[PDB]
From Swiss-Prot:
Region (G-loop): 567-573
Recorded name of the encoding gene: PIK3CG
GO biological process assignments: adaptive immune response; angiogenesis; cell migration; cellular response to cAMP; dendritic cell chemotaxis; endocytosis; G protein-coupled receptor signaling pathway; hepatocyte apoptotic process
Record: residues binding ATP: 593-602, 628-636, 725-731
Localization, UniProt: Cytoplasm; Cell membrane
Annotated spans, Catalytic loop: 707-715
Record comment: activity regulation: Activated by both the alpha and the beta-gamma G proteins following stimulation of G protein-coupled receptors (GPCRs). Activation by GPCRs is assisted by the regulatory subunits (PIK3R5 or PIK3R6) leading to the translocation from the cytosol to the plasma membrane and to kinase activation. Inhibited by AS-604850 and AS-605240.
EC number(s) recorded for this UniProt protein: 2.7.1.137, 2.7.1.153, 2.7.1.154, 2.7.11.1
Keywords recorded for this protein, A-Z: Angiogenesis, ATP-binding, Cell membrane, Chemotaxis, Cytoplasm, Disease variant, Endocytosis, Immunity, Inflammatory response, Kinase, Lipid metabolism, Membrane, Nucleotide-binding, Phosphoprotein, Serine/threonine-protein kinase, Transferase
Entry annotated with the keyword Nucleotidyltransferase: no
Every PIK helical domain range: 308-487
Record's miscellaneous remark: Candidate target in therapy for inflammatory diseases. Selective inhibitors and protein ablation are anti-inflammatory in multiple disease models such as asthma, rheumatoid arthritis, allergy, systemic lupus erythematosus, airway inflammation, lung injury and pancreatitis.
Name used for this protein in its record: Phosphatidylinositol 4,5-bisphosphate 3-kinase catalytic subunit gamma isoform
């Protein structure tokens, strides 16, 4: 039971979806999946070390990069320690463990066991890890900052307490009975038919149509559709995709083999997803909850069970060629049969595996058999070093086979939380391509999230983001989330509970303000008053005392700095909110600044940001820093989210608006003055010039690769301290933005060269060819991003942008050349496409 039914309401209200609800299901898969997950939850709960769990030490086995060993000129590191305005600085060896450091500290003083917490954060320096390997440390040294730690006592694991739990040979065929809708769209007499496909990872196996019939609110064929495939030749995870044309208006899917390995039988009345008017919402096994407005379709099943000599030379080379080839290069029939015939050779090359397993006639019993024997002798794959790009490739929409997919997930098991975090978002999205609710991958996210509060925290927001936006996938995700929460342990349930109230509160406010200045560029006096009064109304009895900042879970925000909060001057009306630190042990009055925004789909931004982080760590692997500023951003519901404000930064545009602020002339010297005036010492200035040259360079390459490089001034920002960065990725060309104002900081004005600019192309090109060394990873992530993150998209040309840009199949010379030309376009065009935003105000 009873007090255990509150818990459920807690869960549902925490999730944003009621998973005990059974009104949008035609079977028990979700229920079954709720049951299936108890063990892997309990298992992981049971085996986690309570102390290290409560402190969630954020840590990495990566080597410390060159550019930070450079920053330590003494093989020794300073750490200020505090007890209560009593503090001493300690020389420490980069290889010193924390316990080891406590040894030397107790030694120092008086002439039990406490723990090193970071000043101002919910971050601890604990565990047999040399300090060189805690992230905070690496982050402090990056920025030229000191390292402030208070000594306090550990958090009681009691607070992580988890609740008690006490839980034939026949051809296949389908009777299309007919379809219904209540209200008919365009109205004038058109014509309509049903298309029934037998699908397996977007490979199509058979297809049947109906004769068409006049499009009216009710249409009844009552036909058998005898397909070409044999019942027994059906593979697990095969979808019966049902589609409607007149062209494509609606689609829906049914697993032909249920989660119990049972051929699917009987009557079904399926409510169908309308078209927007390829992508991952097409694949779903879910039905439209909206029974009242959706088109639907009746059908019937009743058809039970089921569960090397020497290769030539020039063929080996055709083979190696095929294998050695981007994920988007499609395979000829000729290729596929080659791969299949020489599968045992193909098997020694882990890079072949995606190509190889998509050369499988999955519509043949006998061949899948062989394909499993093939997976049996996995020596080489098991032993290969982890390649995430490769691994990821095998979790995309192209692979429905449960066992292919699961070897990829084997490979992830060896990732440390550091990397789990990098890829967490994409991996969560990759759930959408899983044929069944319960999957190896789902279970793996579950483990890793429960094992580590950082992953757990981000897992929560990532699943919740989707649950609240997508009906296609909310059911499945809601089940995974519920699984998580039942293991994360009441500490976090309270945290998530705080957090969820705050962002529901603050979105209420966000939307109410849009109502009050329609478009009208200016923001009425009236507006700001009301914003002020609401936030005051909120703070006085309703808002929590403090709360974790979802995009950065080490930060506890306290009260609002109402004075500093405002509505932004947008066509949308985002909030500029700022909070005090709730941590009194913090080093500053410097606020936490968060922007809330409705009107853009931030799921996209989230993705782009995550790819930015990935690029930054690729550059880590060649001892390269380009100071990208992939600020925090978390989507939270329908076209609405939050955004980390970056301290001390303005808009390239505004730096123009200041001096001239014209309707839109444009000047080249202005940026460089703006730096001087924000550099209290001329040598710090050269650091701004420094940071800028990198940041510019970073964003130049990145932005180009993603093809989001032609942007307006207003959507680029720089820090008072040189760090340039792009924003707002919800929104003649130019490849990327290299305006003449930038180049004047690089000591050039219209076609010359100079110390820092030589440096600029040097870094740029380094950066560029460095990402080409991870081509397949970027291609797979990008392609997935578009499939899980976008509007509709061409399953060739939208995606194919990024191979031409990564200049696939090219030696480093051509490529370097290519990139350099992409610079020279921005110097042909100078201010031209910048200038052009304005003009089309009327075109
Ligand atoms: C953060 C504490 C207050 N503060 C301390 N220094 C400043 C100077 C002003 N700094 C900024 O405005 N920084 C910004 N950072 C971002 C990051 C992202 C976005 C953004 C990204 N995407 C979509 C957007 O549309 C609203 C906005 C805007 C800003 S402004 C403000």
């Amino acid at each position: 039971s009873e007090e255990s039914q509150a818990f459920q309401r807690q869960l549902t209200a925490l999730i944003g979806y009621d998973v005990t609800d059974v009104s949008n299901v035609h079977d028990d898969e979700l229920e079954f999946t709720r049951r299936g997950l108890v063990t892997p939850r309990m298992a992981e709960v049971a085996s986690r070390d309570p102390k290290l769990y409560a402190m969630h030490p954020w840590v990495t086995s990566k080597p410390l990069p060159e550019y930070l060993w450079k920053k330590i000129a003494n093989n020794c590191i300073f750490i200020v320690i505090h007890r209560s305005t009593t503090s001493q600085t300690i020389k420490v060896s980069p290889d010193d463990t924390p316990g080891a450091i406590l040894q030397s500290f107790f030694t120092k003083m008086a002439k039990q066991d406490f723990v090193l917490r970071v000043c101002g954060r919910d971050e601890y320096l604990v565990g047999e890890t040399p300090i060189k390997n805690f992230q905070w440390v690496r982050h402090c040294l990056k920025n030229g900052e000191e390292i402030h730690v208070v000594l306090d006592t550990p958090p009681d694991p009691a607070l992580d307490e988890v609740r008690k739990e006490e839980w034939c040979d026949r051809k296949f065929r389908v009777k299309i009975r007919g379809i219904d809708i209540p209200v008919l769209p365009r109205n004038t007499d058109l014509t309509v038919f049903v298309e029934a496909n037998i699908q397996h990872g977007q490979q199509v196996l058979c297809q049947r149509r109906t004769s068409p019939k006049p499009f009216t609110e009710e249409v009844l064929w009552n036909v058998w559709l005898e397909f070409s495939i044999k019942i027994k030749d059906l593979p697990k995870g095969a979808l019966l995709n049902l589609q409607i044309y007149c062209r494509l208006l609606y689609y829906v899917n049914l697993l032909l083999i249920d989660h119990r390995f049972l051929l699917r039988r009987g009557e079904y009345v399926l409510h169908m997803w309308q078209i927007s008017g390829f992508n991952a919402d097409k694949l779903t096994s879910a039905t439209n909850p909206d029974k009242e407005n959706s088109m639907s379709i009746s059908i019937l099943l009743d058809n039970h069970p089921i569960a090397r000599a020497e290769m030539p030379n020039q063929l080996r080379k055709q083979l190696e060629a095929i294998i050695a080839t981007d994920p988007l290069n499609p395979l000829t029939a000729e290729d596929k049969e080659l791969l299949w015939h020489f599968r045992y050779e193909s098997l020694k090359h882990p890079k072949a595996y995606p190509k190889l397993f998509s050369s499988v006639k999955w519509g043949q019993q006998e061949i899948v058999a062989k394909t499993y024997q093939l997976l049996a002798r996995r020596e080489v794959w098991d032993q290969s070093a982890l390649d995430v790009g490769l691994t990821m490739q095998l979790l995309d929409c192209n692979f429905s086979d449960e066992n292919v997919r699961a070897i990829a997930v084997q490979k992830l098991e060896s990732l440390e939380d550091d990397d789990v975090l990098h890829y967490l978002l994409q991996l969560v999205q990759a759930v959408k391509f899983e044929p069944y609710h319960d999957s190896a991958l789902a279970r793996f996210l579950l483990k890793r999230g429960l094992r580590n509060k950082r992953i757990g925290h981000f897992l929560f927001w990532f699943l919740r983001s989707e649950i609240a936006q997508s009906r296609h996938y909310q059911q499945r995700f809601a089940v995974i989330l519920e699984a998580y929460l039942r293991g994360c342990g009441t500490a976090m349930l309270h945290d998530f509970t705080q957090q969820v109230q705050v962002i529901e509160m603050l979105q209420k406010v966000t939307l109410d303000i849009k109502s009050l200045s329609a478009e009208k560029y200016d923001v009425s006096s009236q507006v700001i008053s009301q914003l002020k009064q609401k936030l005051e109304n909120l703070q006085n009895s309703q808002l929590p005392e403090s709360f974790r900042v979802p995009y950065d879970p080490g930060l506890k925000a306290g009260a609002l700095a109402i004075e500093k909060c405002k509505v932004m001057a947008s066509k949308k009306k985002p909030l500029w909110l700022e909070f005090k630190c709730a941590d009194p042990t913090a080093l500053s009055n410097e606020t936490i600044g968060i922007i809330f925004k409705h009107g853009d789909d931030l799921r996209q931004d989230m993705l782009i940001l995550q790819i930015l982080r990935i690029m930054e760590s690729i550059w880590e692997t060649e001892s390269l820093d380009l100071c990208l500023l992939p600020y925090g951003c978390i989507s939270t519901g329908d076209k609405i989210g939050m955004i980390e404000i970056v301290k001390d930064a303005t808009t390239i545009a505004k730096i123009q608006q200041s001096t001239v602020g014209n309707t839109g002339a444009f000047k080249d010297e202005v940026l460089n003055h703006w730096l001087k005036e924000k550099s209290p010492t001329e040598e710090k200035f050269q650091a701004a010039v420094e940071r800028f040259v990198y940041s510019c360079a970073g964003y130049c390459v990145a932005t180009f690769v993603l093809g989001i490089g032609d942007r307006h001034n207003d959507n680029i920002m720089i820090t008072e301290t040189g760090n340039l960065f792009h924003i707002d990725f919800g929104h003649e060309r130019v490849p990327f933005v290299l305006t003449p104002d930038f180049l004047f900081v690089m000591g050039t004005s219209g076609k010359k060269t100079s110390p820092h600019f030589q440096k600029f192309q040097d870094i740029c090109v380094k950066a560029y060819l460095a990402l080409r060394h991870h081509t397949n990873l970027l291609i797979i992530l990008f392609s997935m991003m578009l499939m899980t993150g976008m509007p509709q998209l061409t399953s060739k040309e939208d995606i194919e942008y990024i191979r031409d840009a990564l200049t696939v199949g090219k030696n480093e010379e051509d490529a370097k050349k290519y990139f350099l030309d992409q610079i020279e376009v921005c110097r042909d065009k100078g201010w031209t496409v910048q200038f052009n935003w304005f003009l089309h105000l009327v075109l």
